[PDB]
Structure formats: C-alpha cells, structure tokens
Amino acid sequence: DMKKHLNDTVSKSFIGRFFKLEARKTTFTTELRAATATFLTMAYIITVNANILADSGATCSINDCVLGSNPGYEQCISRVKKDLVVATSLSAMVGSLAMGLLANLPFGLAPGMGANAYIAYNVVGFRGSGSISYHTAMAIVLLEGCAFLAVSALGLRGKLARLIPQTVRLACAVGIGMFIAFVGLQMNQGIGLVGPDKSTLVTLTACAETDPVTGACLGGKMKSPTFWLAVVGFLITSFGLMKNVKGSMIYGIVFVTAISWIRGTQVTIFPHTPLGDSNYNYFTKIVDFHKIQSTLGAISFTEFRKSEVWVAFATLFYVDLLGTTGVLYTMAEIGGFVEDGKFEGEYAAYLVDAGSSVVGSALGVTTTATFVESSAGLKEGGKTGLTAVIVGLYFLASMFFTPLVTNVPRWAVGPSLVMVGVMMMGVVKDIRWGETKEAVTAFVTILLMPLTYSIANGIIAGIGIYLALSMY
Amino acid sequence: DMKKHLNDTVSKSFIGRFFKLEARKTTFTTELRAATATFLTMAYIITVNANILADSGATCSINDCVLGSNPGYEQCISRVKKDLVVATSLSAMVGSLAMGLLANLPFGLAPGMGANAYIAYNVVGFRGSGSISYHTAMAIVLLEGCAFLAVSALGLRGKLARLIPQTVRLACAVGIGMFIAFVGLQMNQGIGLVGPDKSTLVTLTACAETDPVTGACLGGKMKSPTFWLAVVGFLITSFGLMKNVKGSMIYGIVFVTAISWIRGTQVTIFPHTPLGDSNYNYFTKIVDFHKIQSTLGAISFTEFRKSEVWVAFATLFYVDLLGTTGVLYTMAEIGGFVEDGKFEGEYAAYLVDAGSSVVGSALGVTTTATFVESSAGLKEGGKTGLTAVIVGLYFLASMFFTPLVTNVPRWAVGPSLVMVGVMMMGVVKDIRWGETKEAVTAFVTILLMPLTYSIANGIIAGIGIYLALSMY
Ligand SMILES: C/C(=C\CNc1ncnc2[nH]cnc12)CO
Ligand SMILES: C/C(=C\CNc1ncnc2[nH]cnc12)CO
C-alpha cells in the first residue's frame, strides 16, 4: 500500500497543491509514466536535429580550413557537431521547463522539424552554399521570434491565422513532409538511394563503388553495404508502429548505430584514418561534460540591407504560423481541457512558444514548436505540468552522454527522416479534392516543394495560384 | 415536331432495332449529344500522345543523321511525328468502333496515359537512351496484348486482379499521376520550370537565356517568354473545370498554339531557320491526306534472349491490369447497367481492350484502355453503342487535319501533362492512412516513382515492402 502513501506526501505538499493534484483528478505516478512515454516518443530529435544543422555550413569559414576534404575543416565540423548536441538539449530543456511552470500544460518543447530543414538546406546551403552565412540566419531567428512574441502578446494571432484558406495550410504541411523525406535520400544527409543523371534529373544510384570526392559512382547498383543496413533499420523502425511499442524510432536508430560501431567492418564509422582514430579516442569515454565554445553567441545585424533575406523572414513567419495554429488546439481535445471557447492557458501557451525562440536564436538552434508526437503521454494520463517538468529534467540529464550522440552515422537518420514524412502525409485525406479550385492549388503546392528543392518556392507558387483563380 | 420524326425513321429501322433503342429508353439525338460531349472531353490525346512518342527515339538510327542538332535527323523526326498523329488517330478509331459494334457499351478507346509514358521515357529513353530500341518495345506490346487476350478469353482476370492488395493499386495510380506531372516540367517535353544543379539535384530554372545545345542556362530566373505563356494557358485550362464547360483542355492547347503560330514573336514556333521554313510551307495547307511510310510495321523478335526486357513485360502487365480492373466497373454504376453481379457485356468488354492492342503494336502506338474521361457522355444520356460509333467516326474525320496537329509547340502540352496528374491525384483520399502497414507502402510507392524517374522501380519497391512487413 505504500505506493498510495507517495500520493499523499506529495499531493498535500507544496508541489501537489501548486499543480492542483486534487483537481483534474490524476496521480503522481500516472503523470510520471506519461512523462516517460512522451520523452521516449520524442527523444530522437536530439540526434536527428544535431546532424541536420551540423552539415549546414559551420561557423568556421575558409580561414580555418570548404568542400575539399581537408582535415583542418573536418576538425572544426566535428567540434561544431559536438556543440550542437548540447545546444539542442539545452534548448529542449528550456522552453519545456517554462511551459511546465508558467502554465499548467503537459506538453514538451524542442526545435521541431521543418524550420531546421528550411534554414539549414535552403538559406545557408550545404557547407557554405546559399546567400546568407550562419550568423544572419540566427539574426533572422531572433527577429522572427521577437515579432511573433509581439504579435501573440496583444491579440492578432487568432485574427491572423484564421484568414488563411483551409487548403493552403494542409498542402504546405504535406509538402514539408515530402521535402523532409526527399532530403533523406541523397548521399549528403541520407542513405544514397538517389543520385544525378545527364538525360533525366533523378536516377536510382544506390551505388557501391561511389566517388568519395564528388558524389558519383563507378558501377554497381543496389549493392551498397550501408544502404541495405539502412533499409533493415527502417524495417525495424516500421515494425514498431504496428503492435504499438512505446518508442521505436530511437530503437531503430540505436540498433543501426550499435551495429555501425564495430571497427573493421564495411559499414563502420571509425575507419583507420586519423580522423577515425580521434573520433574513437573521444568515444572511449561514455559520460563527458561539454561546454559550448564556438556557437555560444554569434549574431550579426550588419547584413539586413539586402534582399534574399526578408523573403526568408516572411517564409519563416508563414511556416511558424502554420505550425502553431494547428497542433496546439488538436492536442487539447484528447485531454479534459477544452471548454466552450477557452483553454485556460491558450494565451500563456502561445507566449512560451515564441519566448523560447529568442533564447534559442543565440544558442545554436532554430524556432521550436510543441511536439505533436507527445499525445503518447496524454493518451495515458496526466492533466497538469508534471510531465513537462519531467521531460525537461530528462533532457537535462541526457546531455551528459554526448559521446554516444556525436558518433551516430548519417545513414542511421535516413530512416527517421523518411518516417517523419510518412507520419506527416497522413493529413492529406482532409483536403477537399472534389472542387478544382482547391485541388489545383493543393497539388501545385505539394509537388513544387520536393521537385524544386525549396519550401518558399512552393508557398509562393501556391499562394499566387489561389489568388489568381479567385480574381472577382 | 419533325425532330421526333427523326426518332421513328431510325428507331424502327435496322439501326434502331439492332441497338435496341426502345429498350434502355433513350433517343438518337441524346446519344449523338453524349457522343459529342465525350469526344470533346477526350479529343486532346491526339496531340498529347503524338508529342510524347515522337521525342522517344524515332525509328531512324545514326544511319540517317542523334542529339547533335543535325538537320538530317530533324527531318526524320519531323516525318515520324507526322506519322504518329495518323497512327494514334487510327488506333483510336479502331477499338472504339469494335467496342461500339461487338458490344452495346457507350465507351471510347484510345492509347491512354501511363503505358505511353512508361515505354516512351524509361525503356526507349529520350532519343536513343535506354536499353531496348523502338522495335523491341512494339514486340513487347504485341506479346503483352496476346497474353492479356489469352488471360481474358478463359477466365482468370477476375481471379487475378482481385488478389492484389487494395493499397498498392491506389498508390501506383497516384505515383503514375505524379510521374506524368513531373515529366512535363523539364526542358525536354515540358515548359522548363525544373533544371539541373550541382549541390542539390533539382532547382527552379525557369531560365530565359538558356543553352540550346545542352540544356543549362546563363542567367535570368522566372523570366522565360514561353514559360509565362504556358502558365497563362494553364490558367485558362484550369478556369474550365470550375463553371463546368464541356471541354477546356483542348481549349487551352488551342489558345496557346494559336498564339504561338504568329511568325516573328519571341514565343514563335516557325523561326527563320530552314527547318522552320519547311514546317511553315507544310503548314500553309490545312487539310492533307497522309499515309504511313516509316512506322507501318516494325517488329523484331530477335532480342528476346536478354534481361532488361522481361522486366518491362512484367511491369506493363501490372500497369495494364491496374488500369482495367478499375475504370470499367466504375463507369457502369453511373448508367443503368449494373445488375446484381453482371454487366451484360463485361466478358465482351475485356476482350476488346486486349484485342485492340495487337492491332496497335504494329501500328505505332501503345496499349489502350477505356477512357475514364468519358463519363461526360454517360452523365447526359445514351445507353447503347451510339456514342462509340460516333466517337470512332469523329476520330476518323479528325486525321485529315494533320498540319494543324503536327505543329503544336511542346510548351502547349505541359499544362495538359500537369493537369492529368492533378486529376489522377484525386483518388488519394480512399487510401486507409490510419494503419502503418498501408501508410508506409503507399508513401514509398508514391514517392519513389517521380524521384527516381521510373515506374517499375516504384512498383518493385512497393511490393517488396508490403511483402516483408507481413512475413508471418
Ligand atoms: C513550427 C516549427 C516546428 C514545427 N515542427 C513540429 N511541430 C509539431 N510536432 C512535431 N514533431 C516533429 N516536428 C514537429 C518551428 O518552430
Ligand atoms: C491501362 C492503359 C492506359 C490507362 N490510361 C487511362 N485509363 C483510363 N482513362 C484515361 N484517361 C487518360 N488516360 C487514361 C494502357 O493501355
């Protein structure tokens, strides 16, 4: 019986009374279990979001040498990838802690997919491409976060995110899902299923004897030793949604990485090059305390005088308004929160999702949103902020394992990137495909995002068609 | 009143009694109007299917000169494109006539989208690419048609097209729609919205100062004089489905072509090169009788001893079985045809759709299927084969205008190719997106077709995942 003794020494204490444990009937153990489930569902991103931003033009320029395979640049990119893990863990612990404390909402915060890909692979490019360097991207994040905080402070978001047509938002979500799936197939961040061609633009080039320098290959199709390991990892992950295990994405990532940690095999991650020797020597120790040394703060408000920047600002505004106008209300009816027209926390909910982006802009991360993959805790129990606090505590006591998170091979996150798109595509059945007016714009927005390799292009081409087709 | 006098001099005559005009109550005028509507809906393909097969490695090899911009090869490709128009018109008149006469079904036959793209852009390649030359493709069509006729003669199709899982077929249809939309964007058959890149694989390159030889460009984005004309033609076409005009696709094609026929403008199709002079000199006359001289018959059963051929045979079998198991029954409930379990013509319907592919294999065309875009006649009236016969008569008296169909610019069919994909995508809301088992395979099949630029790759990757995920 002493189990229930833990629910009277806590509920009647200050901690229980502060969160109103007696109201919205629940127990401390149930809230802890819900927090554990929603952490296991979400924990993947700490190693997924680290590998996307790392290969996105690190802070060191040619002065510390880009794409020429020089060990000097490789050491810097290793250090930067080491720092972004801690940065993402900190940005997930904060925000989640505020949402737990400022409001009584059992949610979680972390830099989600979709804004990280946008600023990572379109404006900063792949290791020095694009138009704007790394500092200007974080300046843009700062400006967008401040603007969204101002907009949510005194009410316009409800009156601004409701006038957008109901089809463009869903089409944009599907297009972002397709693009995040597409980016996980090239031999730059993905597994290597898609390669270049001369006659056509795309061609199946799972390719064994590949060219290390450029990216082409010299014969051998669908016989890559690492591509098949990635495929079996994807199958292991996919056999985790059926039969409904708690967390399967991290299970597949862990299995693939653990198989890859063997030294000497053809799918290894620690080769005999001295880069591999240094990586292994760092990997010997498991627990390591790391302090940010490179991307602690780097903001430059000196290039806000040209174009190709404010377009990114508008696109980030549109994507972040798409993200939050949706998931927040959706994961309110699952629990016993929704009333006739109120959340009892909606106003305080929108404030944190914008406030904990200013703290992340000068930290190494992108804008954050409440995770949709957190209903695994709501569907069990817990009605107050005893899950957000525990999630923040977990993320805080998950950054000490940096050596086990900075050596994940890039072919272990390809399945995760593909599965994110599969999960996102599920909303495509709510679009009214009957009328031509919605079908044309939805199809254009969906198709133009992965083919042209741009999200802003898709949004700007979907808005124009919908505007022109209704010129009355 | 003499209008109704036309319904007694015909219904009581041999023509009326043969088609049982008194039964399945209808009138001759109603059937003629339905035939007119279903011809206007379908007529586009005569200029759409001609431009796809023309730029697919014409029969003349390097001996009559490939992609080097030599006038000798250009004359041959012009002659071949001239011949395929008549070939497609003949293949549409036949088959439709048989379906009108052999059975009492008010449908129409023509070489539909999806098998033409497959054999055109994957196995014969773009002007000499691929593994198999033109003759082997028609031999494959002959073999597939004979095999399907044998299978439909004594019953297996009902017992063979029903065991395929309900998700793979829909995913394949959506993937073919996406691929047919994708193929209409490159600067080879499409308008020019998508071009190559070095860092990424795809990049928006609507590009004004393009390179005539290779396909790249030398600066200027989204400022192509012909791309904007194609866009406005697409808008004209799309403002034809809302407000429900009879036929709008051919309207947009005609408008774009008529604007393009002006000589001297920047979007012209008759430049001052002597190729343009010869094309214009042929275009002076409007009505011209043409006889097939190059692709009348060319079948070679000499290379059926290697691989990379029977794979195409299996893929064609799968696609053609997907096509017919669906549309035929669907456009049976619209009219008063469906009974408890019978069509009164199902067995005779499946026979013609396979028989009129043998006649087309040694004619210049691909496998044909009953057009889904023929319900425009069913939804008005007509219950017997007084529309198929009229459709065949129209197609017969539509091949005399070859000069007005062989000079259509390639940027006038891009909107049509895009719109076909938009119309095909509408079935995506019947797939069960809830269970992971169907969602994963549907997403993989949908995504892998346009990205890898192959339909067989998508089918073979969607079948394997569904088989592996159910290994019990
Ligand atoms: C709106 C933004 C991100 C949204 N991304 C996500 N939003 C909600 N749930 C998720 N799960 C994974 N990624 C996400 C940028 O702050
Ligand atoms: C099965 C095949 C083609 C199917 N294509 C089509 N099938 C049905 N309706 C259409 N409208 C345009 N194209 C089509 C090949 O014979």
Side-chain angles (χ1 to χ4, degrees):
Chain A
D1 55 352
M2 82 305 287
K3 238 204 168 195
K4 68 188 300 206
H5 277 99
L6 260 65
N7 262 268
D8 300 71
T9 52
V10 172
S11 67
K12 264 309 307 183
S13 175
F14 289 159
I15 270 178
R17 204 168 88 261
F18 176 73
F19 290 93
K20 293 213 90 62
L21 261 292
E22 301 305 20
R24 51 182 85 221
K25 165 63 151 283
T26 206
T27 52
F28 176 81
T29 312
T30 308
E31 278 163 337
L32 193 133
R33 214 57 79 215
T36 290
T38 195
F39 175 57
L40 274 182
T41 303
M42 157 198 328
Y44 76 96
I45 196 139
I46 178 189
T47 166
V48 176
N49 198 62
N51 266 310
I52 277 180
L53 271 155
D55 82 352
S56 88
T59 78
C60 50
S61 171
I62 208 78
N63 49 3
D64 175 272
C65 183
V66 169
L67 267 191
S69 300
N70 200 24
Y73 184 110
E74 301 314 292
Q75 280 175 26
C76 175
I77 194 42
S78 67
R79 286 189 299 271
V80 170
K81 190 161 77 177
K82 207 176 292 184
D83 294 334
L84 272 312
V85 169
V86 161
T88 295
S89 204
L90 272 189
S91 176
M93 159 200 167
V94 83
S96 279
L97 266 194
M99 164 93 72
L101 291 200
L102 266 47
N104 291 123
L105 305 180
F107 296 169
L109 291 205
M113 324 286 318
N116 41 358
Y118 178 60
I119 73 184
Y121 281 130
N122 286 323
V123 308
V124 186
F126 184 89
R127 274 171 192 179
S129 294
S131 306
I132 39 184
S133 68
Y134 201 50
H135 303 169
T136 315
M138 311 295 218
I140 288 171
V141 179
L142 189 74
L143 281 185
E144 186 277 335
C146 55
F148 203 105
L149 198 64
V151 152
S152 299
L154 75 76
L156 301 83
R157 190 223 32 79
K159 267 323 171 153
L160 202 173
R162 205 189 63 138
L163 65 72
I164 272 173
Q166 198 216 81
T167 311
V168 172
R169 140 178 72 203
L170 297 190
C172 199
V174 178
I176 301 171
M178 265 186 189
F179 170 67
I180 210 59
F182 182 40
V183 70
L185 301 184
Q186 282 65 0
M187 172 265 258
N188 77 20
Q189 180 46 228
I191 59 193
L193 196 144
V194 159
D197 215 308
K198 204 267 184 172
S199 162
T200 57
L201 283 302
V202 195
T203 280
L204 169 53
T205 66
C207 215
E209 295 325 279
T210 202
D211 209 7
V213 177
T214 53
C217 72
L218 288 206
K221 292 293 183 292
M222 280 271 213
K223 290 170 40 200
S224 311
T226 172
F227 165 65
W228 288 110
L229 180 54
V231 163
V232 69
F234 177 76
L235 274 181
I236 281 283
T237 291
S238 212
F239 210 85
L241 301 203
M242 30 178 312
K243 268 62 186 294
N244 270 318
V245 291
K246 305 306 295 311
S248 74
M249 293 217 47
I250 187 55
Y251 284 14
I253 287 183
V254 156
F255 177 74
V256 176
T257 303
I259 276 283
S260 307
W261 275 338
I262 298 284
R263 219 149 171 286
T265 207
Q266 312 105 49
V267 293
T268 191
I269 193 66
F270 305 144
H272 262 278
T273 167
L275 192 150
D277 272 336
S278 181
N279 267 111
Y280 191 78
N281 271 277
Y282 183 85
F283 173 70
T284 84
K285 49 175 170 309
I286 310 129
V287 153
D288 166 13
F289 56 98
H290 195 86
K291 25 182 295 186
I292 309 206
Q293 323 194 350
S294 196
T295 174
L296 191 40
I299 317 297
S300 69
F301 283 101
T302 320
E303 318 289 16
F304 278 97
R305 285 94 199 258
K306 46 188 50 183
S307 207
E308 199 69 284
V309 179
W310 302 100
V311 159
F313 179 80
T315 304
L316 250 182
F317 220 102
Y318 204 109
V319 169
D320 173 53
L321 249 182
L322 151 61
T324 300
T325 184
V327 152
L328 219 32
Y329 212 79
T330 288
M331 311 159 14
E333 280 164 342
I334 307 330
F337 297 163
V338 171
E339 275 323 296
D340 48 358
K342 284 187 284 189
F343 177 80
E344 157 286 335
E346 186 81 342
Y347 180 64
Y350 290 128
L351 259 283
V352 175
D353 303 348
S356 147
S357 167
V358 192
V359 81
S361 51
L363 209 54
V365 297
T366 66
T367 57
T368 173
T370 292
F371 264 46
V372 53
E373 336 171 68
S374 77
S375 48
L378 293 179
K379 282 185 281 186
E380 280 206 359
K383 313 290 183 183
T384 319
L386 266 283
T387 60
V389 177
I390 301 299
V391 161
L393 276 190
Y394 270 160
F395 262 102
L396 156 74
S398 166
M399 81 183 56
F400 289 154
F401 293 106
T402 305
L404 309 192
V405 200
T406 199
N407 291 276
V408 156
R410 47 99 157 179
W411 54 75
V413 306
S416 287
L417 276 176
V418 172
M419 272 296 298
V420 159
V422 167
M423 289 184 5
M424 261 173 179
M425 186 213 101
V427 82
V428 86
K429 84 180 302 183
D430 314 355
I431 304 181
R432 287 191 303 278
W433 288 102
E435 300 79 319
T436 321
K437 175 80 161 297
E438 329 266 19
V440 169
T441 168
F443 179 56
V444 169
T445 285
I446 281 175
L447 185 62
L448 273 187
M449 261 181 231
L451 287 196
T452 55
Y453 210 72
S454 167
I455 295 184
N457 272 138
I459 299 172
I460 201 63
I463 287 296
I465 272 177
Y466 195 96
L467 195 276
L469 253 58
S470 147
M471 218 44 188
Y472 278 174
Chain B
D1 55 352
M2 82 305 287
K3 238 204 168 195
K4 68 188 300 206
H5 277 99
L6 260 65
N7 262 268
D8 300 71
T9 52
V10 172
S11 67
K12 264 309 307 183
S13 175
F14 289 159
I15 270 178
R17 204 168 88 261
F18 176 73
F19 290 93
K20 293 213 90 62
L21 261 292
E22 301 305 20
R24 51 182 85 221
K25 165 63 151 283
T26 206
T27 52
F28 176 81
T29 312
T30 308
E31 278 163 337
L32 193 133
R33 214 57 79 215
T36 290
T38 195
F39 175 57
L40 274 182
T41 303
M42 157 198 328
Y44 76 96
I45 196 140
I46 178 189
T47 166
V48 176
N49 198 62
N51 266 310
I52 277 180
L53 271 155
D55 82 352
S56 88
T59 78
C60 50
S61 171
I62 208 78
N63 49 3
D64 175 272
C65 183
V66 169
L67 267 191
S69 300
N70 200 24
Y73 184 110
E74 301 314 292
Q75 280 175 26
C76 175
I77 194 42
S78 67
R79 286 189 299 271
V80 170
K81 190 161 77 177
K82 207 176 292 184
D83 294 334
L84 272 312
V85 169
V86 161
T88 295
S89 204
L90 272 189
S91 176
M93 159 200 167
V94 83
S96 279
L97 266 194
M99 164 93 72
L101 291 200
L102 266 47
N104 291 123
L105 305 180
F107 296 169
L109 292 205
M113 324 286 318
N116 41 358
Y118 178 60
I119 73 184
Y121 281 130
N122 286 323
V123 308
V124 186
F126 184 89
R127 274 171 192 179
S129 294
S131 306
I132 39 184
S133 68
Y134 201 50
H135 303 169
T136 315
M138 311 295 218
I140 288 171
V141 179
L142 190 74
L143 281 185
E144 186 277 336
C146 55
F148 203 105
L149 198 64
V151 152
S152 299
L154 75 76
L156 301 83
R157 190 223 32 79
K159 267 323 171 153
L160 202 173
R162 205 189 63 138
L163 65 72
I164 272 173
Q166 198 216 81
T167 311
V168 172
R169 140 178 72 203
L170 297 190
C172 199
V174 178
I176 301 171
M178 265 186 189
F179 170 67
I180 210 59
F182 182 40
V183 71
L185 302 184
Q186 282 65 0
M187 172 265 258
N188 77 20
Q189 180 46 228
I191 59 193
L193 196 144
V194 159
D197 215 308
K198 204 267 184 172
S199 162
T200 57
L201 283 302
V202 195
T203 280
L204 169 53
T205 66
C207 215
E209 295 325 279
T210 202
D211 209 7
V213 177
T214 53
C217 72
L218 288 206
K221 292 293 183 292
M222 280 271 213
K223 290 169 40 200
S224 311
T226 172
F227 165 65
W228 288 110
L229 180 54
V231 163
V232 69
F234 177 76
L235 274 181
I236 281 283
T237 291
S238 212
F239 210 85
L241 301 203
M242 30 178 312
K243 268 62 186 294
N244 270 318
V245 291
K246 305 306 295 311
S248 74
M249 293 217 47
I250 187 55
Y251 284 14
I253 287 183
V254 156
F255 177 74
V256 176
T257 303
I259 276 283
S260 307
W261 275 338
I262 298 284
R263 219 149 171 286
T265 207
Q266 312 105 48
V267 293
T268 191
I269 193 66
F270 305 144
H272 262 278
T273 167
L275 192 150
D277 272 336
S278 181
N279 266 111
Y280 191 78
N281 271 277
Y282 183 85
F283 173 70
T284 84
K285 49 175 170 309
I286 310 129
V287 153
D288 166 13
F289 56 98
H290 195 86
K291 26 182 295 186
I292 309 206
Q293 323 194 350
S294 196
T295 174
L296 191 40
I299 317 297
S300 69
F301 283 101
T302 320
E303 318 289 16
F304 278 97
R305 285 94 199 258
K306 46 188 50 183
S307 207
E308 199 69 284
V309 179
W310 302 100
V311 159
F313 179 80
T315 305
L316 250 182
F317 220 102
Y318 204 109
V319 169
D320 173 53
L321 249 182
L322 151 61
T324 300
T325 184
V327 152
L328 219 32
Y329 212 79
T330 288
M331 311 159 14
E333 280 164 342
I334 307 330
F337 297 163
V338 171
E339 275 323 296
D340 48 358
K342 285 187 284 189
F343 177 80
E344 157 286 335
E346 186 81 342
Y347 180 64
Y350 290 128
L351 259 283
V352 175
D353 303 348
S356 147
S357 167
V358 192
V359 81
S361 51
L363 209 54
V365 297
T366 66
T367 57
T368 173
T370 292
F371 264 46
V372 53
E373 336 171 68
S374 77
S375 48
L378 293 179
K379 282 185 281 186
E380 280 206 359
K383 313 290 183 183
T384 319
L386 266 283
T387 60
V389 177
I390 301 299
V391 161
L393 276 190
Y394 270 160
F395 262 102
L396 156 74
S398 166
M399 81 183 56
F400 289 154
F401 293 106
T402 305
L404 309 192
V405 200
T406 199
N407 291 277
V408 156
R410 47 99 157 179
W411 54 75
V413 306
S416 287
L417 276 176
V418 172
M419 272 296 298
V420 159
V422 167
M423 289 184 5
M424 261 173 179
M425 186 213 101
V427 82
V428 86
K429 84 180 302 183
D430 314 355
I431 304 181
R432 287 191 303 278
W433 288 102
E435 300 79 318
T436 321
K437 175 80 161 297
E438 329 266 19
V440 169
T441 168
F443 179 56
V444 169
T445 286
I446 281 175
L447 185 62
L448 273 187
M449 261 181 231
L451 287 196
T452 55
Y453 210 72
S454 167
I455 295 184
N457 272 138
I459 299 172
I460 202 63
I463 287 296
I465 272 177
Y466 195 96
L467 195 276
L469 253 58
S470 147
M471 218 44 188
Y472 278 174

